[PDB]
Write a protein that binds this ligand. Structure first.
Ligand SMILES: NC(=O)c1ccc[n+]([C@@H]2O[C@H](COP(=O)([O-])OP(=O)(O)OC[C@H]3O[C@@H](n4cnc5c(N)ncnc54)[C@H](O)[C@@H]3O)[C@@H](O)[C@H]2O)c1
Ligand SMILES: [Zn+2]
Ligand SMILES: [Zn+2]
Ligand SMILES: [Zn+2]
Ligand SMILES: [Zn+2]
Lengths: 375, 375
């Protein structure tokens, strides 16, 4: 393997439109594999770092971590992948030899866990992308906004090759995160009630999951009332717009629910919402799960007696799925009609029109928009 | 059943020496029981409300909520208890028919949960205590600093009659609170490491639980370095005093343990300790437990990524033990030589020297001082 010349959607500057550039993609080194991206979608996390809203801004940069693609070649030492394999890159990985990989509870691999500041590869600290000899930096070790990318093999999930990559690409971030937030972490019992603050693609995976758990009540909570109608299709039974109420939104919920919900799942990334997501669960057994990544440093607060009232609070990342281990299995779940994915997909654009995807999410019009390479 | 005259140590005024008086104990009304008290000990919670540290001063009052005694009579409607049974009054009850009692998760009876303001019985708002026809108020529905007391049956754990009442009386508050915090909420795995903040009766219960639980490293955290020596008997392998460190205490623990403890237990009620207790645990699988009850209203505060890096925060009450159902069981553990309680009892005084117990505890000289009626 040599260096590939391909198209990538490059961000040169914070909060500005992406540019399709001809870039050069270096070959994979030890433990890296080089992937042909076939399909990708946009996740809000891309937008947050694209706006350099919160994080250390780093530009120029190639975003994208929700994708479906094909292994083009593999690096030295790689035994679990080969050219031609159908794969999903995931923003956080699984080495199989750390305590966290070794743990039943955690997916925060000491090696391959999410790192949002890092713009280069693990191996040598260099970027595999460049234009005119200058590095274009990586994202979450995936950088899927390029026709070809290089990803550590540990962050690459081989899946059933008959799976349509243009549906199952959403399984690589948003969908599983919400889903897992519910099934693996909150773990609502049959008949129980669940509150979900945020109804984007993540929130709706969580809803799909609580329904999957047999929750009897799934309360959708969102500031954008226009997200409400579609939400019932994913298992949501009622929606609440905090603006439509004088009461504290957690007080609104506690009253709806003879005291508060059984589980809540936080999907938007607002600390007050987190505060609100925790305080809206029932005492004694309520468990709140935070999953939206916050931009503020605002503290989680509250009178401790809510806890001493035996309410638990768990935080999660990527639905606590182990990437190489579980995710191939989840994809199988769609072939098997447990999971209905087409409905998460509301827009489609060609790679050449990738900027339409930023526009749609920012207008609250899309859940997921699929971007198609080669167009 | 008629009225009883006996000795009681009555508090007429805050922070003042208790005085032994002859009082009258009315018979128990519906769902109540009258208990002959054999042994009682003091507790920091007694001193606080006795000092009128914070709440609403209420005097005259009969304090005491750790005791072992014998059922003398039961009021109409009591079926789970009869005259002669050995019991422990608990500061909080289990009505068995409220929403909390029905749950698997919670021990916070909607009916019988702790109340520090109430001076009379539930049934009728009246006190069963009097001197010359004037009420002496209850404390925590137990008032065990009396030869006889009347207690709602929901607050009485019928226990093993072979149990030495002069040992197992401490199981009804402080001790079980810590113990359960570990074993029921934190649930440290065999071999895991634990940090415990606060080395009072509660901490030492928590420390004891972790030992029982098979923790391999049990780190004690307290500002009074003089509690450190006695903690090793309770399973603590090492202690750290923040006053001996410039560094934030959570940062210190994290380097000592290569990232933070597997489990933590916050036992002081200091909010600053709550933040540290949560932040000193390991990401991915760390679980922090707050059990110390705050005396101030400061909010818990923390950066959200601390959660999303998959830490978990749980608060519990009375160690998540159900008063009527579980406390008898913890007592079996002492019987079966699983629980070593004796090491907690540092003093014994006759009921007549009850004011010494205040002194001993106020000089921080005691863990527990057992008080013996009839002397
Ligand atoms: N933990 C993970 O591994 C993981 C994976 C994917 C996404 N995320 C993060 O999850 C969050 C959601 O992602 P998404 O793609 O589904 O976003 P999205 O923009 O498509 O949806 C966000 C929803 O939350 C709503 N919202 C915004 N502020 C709110 C507030 N104060 N109160 C209530 N609702 C509010 C918005 O209306 C929006 O509909 C993001 O924060 C993302 O960075 C985390
Ligand atoms: Zn994402
Ligand atoms: Zn690992
Ligand atoms: Zn006590
Ligand atoms: Zn009850």
């Amino acid at each position: 393997s040599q260096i590939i010349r391909c198209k990538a959607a490059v961000a040169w500057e914070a909060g500005k439109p992406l540019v399709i550039e001809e870039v050069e993609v270096a070959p994979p080194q030890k433990h890296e594999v080089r992937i042909k991206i076939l399909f990708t979608s946009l996740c809000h996390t891309d937008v947050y770092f694209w706006e350099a809203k919160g994080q250390t801004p780093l530009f120029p940069r190639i975003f994208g971590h929700e994708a479906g693609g094909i292994v083009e070649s593999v690096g030295e030492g790689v035994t679990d992948l080969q050219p031609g394999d159908h794969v999903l890159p995931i923003f956080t990985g699984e080495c199989g030899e750390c305590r966290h990989c070794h743990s039943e509870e955690s997916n925060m691999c000491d090696l391959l866990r999410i790192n949002t500041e890092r713009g280069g590869m693990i191996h040598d600290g260099e970027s595999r992308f460049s234009i005119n000899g200058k590095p274009i930096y990586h994202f979450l070790g995936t950088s899927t906004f390029s026709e070809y990318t290089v990803v550590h093999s540990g962050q690459v999930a081989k899946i059933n090759p008959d799976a349509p990559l243009d549906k199952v690409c959403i399984v690589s971030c948003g969908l599983s995160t919400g889903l897992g937030a519910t099934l693996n972490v909150a773990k609502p019992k049959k008949g129980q009630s669940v509150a979900i603050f945020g109804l984007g693609a993540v929130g709706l995976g969580a809803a799909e999951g609580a329904r999957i758990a047999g929750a009897s009540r799934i309360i959708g909570v969102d500031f954008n009332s226009k997200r409400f109608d579609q939400a019932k299709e994913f298992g949501v039974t009622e929606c609440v717009n905090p603006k439509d109420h004088d009461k504290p939104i957690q007080q609104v919920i506690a009253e709806m629910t003879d005291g508060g919900v059984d589980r809540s799942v936080e999907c938007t990334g607002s600390v007050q919402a987190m505060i609100q997501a925790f305080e809206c669960v029932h005492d004694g057994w309520g468990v709140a799960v935070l999953v939206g990544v916050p931009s503020k440093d605002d503290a989680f607060k509250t009178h401790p007696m809510n806890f001493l009232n035996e309410r638990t609070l768990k935080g999660t990342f990527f639905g606590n799925y182990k990437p190489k281990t579980d995710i191939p299995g989840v994809v199988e779940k769609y072939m098997n009609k447990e999971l209905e994915l087409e409905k998460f997909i509301t827009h489609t654009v060609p790679f050449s029109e990738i900027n339409k995807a930023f526009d749609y999410m920012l207008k609250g019009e899309s859940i997921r928009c699929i971007i198609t390479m080669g167009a």
